[PDB]
Amino acid sequence: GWVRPDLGELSKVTKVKTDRPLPENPYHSRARPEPNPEAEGDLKPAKHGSRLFFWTM
């Protein structure tokens, strides 16, 4: 009864109904580092300006 596959059928991506659970951490990854805290708040002008030496602005 064996029909021979046509051109392109054997190259298809198919799906398989497996019973195996999906691996959780296939890379055996460490915990990722905590990120640097983000920037919050509204911009206020520099207190007393640049404060570079004798400059007042």
Add this chain to the structure above:
Amino acid sequence: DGPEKNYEKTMAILQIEAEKAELRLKELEVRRLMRARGDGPWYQYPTIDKALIDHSPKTTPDN
């Protein structure tokens, strides 16, 4: 003008000069800590962007 005005103006001058000295010392300290530890917005040197990694299935399974 009266002595009061020079007195008060000296007071305001001294206040903001002292706050500027305090801010300058605090800025120096924050700079030292940020450059030593890298946990602040400053001295953030670039690492590779992880969106450049291709996660598509490769020709071989173990990668």
